[PDB]
């Protein structure tokens, strides 16, 4: 009944619908056919014989690479009633991070974001491309996708990208960090660090923690071969402008990363890349800058902020 | 200096050139790029300093898909220098299938088929559909590619395709059965039965073979549910007129798989599809029918070919 509240029932609605059914038909693999359907359904406000019930504002449901999602869903370990339950059955939690809605989970496993029609459609062309990465680099560090789907409210579309949020309120971030291996402007905004556990950026971990993070020798190697995997994979698609996010947790689930201190303390690391969504059609930046990114980038992350011995 | 024999030694000595150098570079991930890559290499009779030697007579050497090879043998457990050893260490042999010469690496892993210019570029569009399905059925039955790569002599292309030998000389064949689930002049030719093991075919199966061959159900269950798989991917690529070959040995390492007899005897059985490479673009059969091939097939094996108790 509220503006967006009126979105945040069709999502539950949508998702509990669509998935739903899903777990109905039986599990097959995944074929290349697969990642270019969009299922679609229509929720009237008088509820049909599929799509009952209502009171939000009659709408319809899209749904992207269905099979697709199912599969990277369970690659990542997220059982389909987890999944319903977290996101269907508990109140969406909106959030204004700095047009473009953002929402977790109650449990803040799931952020929401809606996505512009563009990083949407590119997206969709991702997916071989991410299948084939989750098949051979499990460790992968790039965002976890774990539904694309799209709402038809009235007369517009919004879409939204279902996600992992890397640092759930779980676990207590004594630092946040948000790092590209740029320099320029790559300060925290003054009303950044007027917050609780603020995001910084490039140069404010340059000065604020020079000893930069210790690593034991077997997990920085890990780390860094993922990495340079994952740049990789990122380079080969055209994309840039996205930043590694560090979240440091000092102890003054255990599924993090052990790492010693600039001091002699130790710390529980939590990292993924992000921002990921934006590329540049080939079909205006030169051919060369996506790899000089990845290059700066990874470089950046494995001689800096990431140390060993 | 055959007219054959020509081939053997562009093939054995470009493999060797090829697939060498690739040991050399540092083993990264495959991307979807990589599918669609050809690399060639010159052999001049004389020599260079990069392709030295000859005695062939003057060759171009192509090979598609380096790094999609590299990775498809090593999921197949082929280590390189065996593959090297086996193919380009130890004369090749030639054999008289019923256009199209066949060989034999001297060890009997490796058939060599060549291939006309359609079935080379038809199987480029399977790579990355192949590559799905071997990370998700991982014990499928289809033809285990390890390589593909062209041969230019004088003037015309010989294209050709390396791939497992379903059925090696180390296991001595007591039947073998070449299946469709189709029935028409589905018989072995009267010279096929003037052969020590011949291969026979549906109806031959039907007659010879009533009982058919048993299975431990939990056996059975398995085969049923990969051919059920392959023959889901094999159609949804339209894909038809492939067969199922099935080697039977009874015995009057020991990875094959366990059936019990017609009578009450024990044998280890071997089986693939093979002949795989013919489809029809759509971009003159029905839309429907590889679904009805695949259907046919898949019953057909399970029900009558394969059965439990």
Do not use: Y
């Given at each position: 009944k509220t503006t967006s509240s009126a979105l945040k029932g069709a999502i539950q609605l949508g998702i509990t619908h669509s998935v739903g059914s899903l777990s109905q038909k039986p599990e097959r693999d995944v074929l290349?056919?697969?990642?270019e359907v969009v299922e679609s359904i229509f929720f009237p406000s008088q509820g049909s014989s599929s799509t009952p019930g209502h009171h939000h504002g009659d709408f319809k449901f899209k749904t992207y690479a269905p099979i697709a999602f199912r599969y990277f869903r369970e690659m990542f370990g997220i059982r389909p009633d987890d999944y319903l339950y977290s996101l269907c059955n508990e109140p969406l939690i909106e959030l204004s991070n700095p047009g473009s809605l953002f929402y977790v989970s109650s449990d803040d496993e799931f952020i929401i974001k809606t996505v512009q029609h563009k990083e949407a459609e590119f997206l969709q062309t991702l997916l071989p491309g991410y299948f084939m990465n989750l098949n051979q680099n499990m460790?992968?560090?790039?965002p976890k996708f774990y539904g694309l789907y799209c709402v038809q409210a009235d007369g517009k579309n919004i879409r939204i990208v279902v996600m992992n949020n890397?640092?759930?309120?779980?676990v207590p971030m004594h630092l946040k960090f948000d790092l590209k291996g740029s320099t320029y402007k790559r300060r925290a905004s003054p009303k950044e660090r007027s917050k609780g556990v603020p995001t910084y950026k490039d140069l404010d971990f340059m000065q604020d923690?020079?000893?930069?993070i210790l690593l034991e020798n077997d997990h920085y190697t890990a780390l860094s071969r993922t990495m340079q995997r994952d740049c990789r994979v990122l380079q080969s698609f055209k994309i840039m402008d996205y930043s590694l996010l560090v979240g440091i947790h000092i102890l003054h689930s255990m599924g993090g990363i052990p790492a010693f201190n600039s001091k002699g303390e130790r710390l529980l690391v939590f990292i993924g890349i992000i921002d990921i969504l934006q590329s540049y059609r080939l079909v205006t930046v030169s051919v060369h800058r996506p790899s000089f990114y990845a290059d700066r980038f990874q470089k950046f992350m494995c001689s800096t902020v990431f140390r060993k011995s």
């Open positions: 290349m056919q697969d990642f460790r992968t560090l790039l890397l640092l759930p309120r779980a923690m020079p000893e930069g």
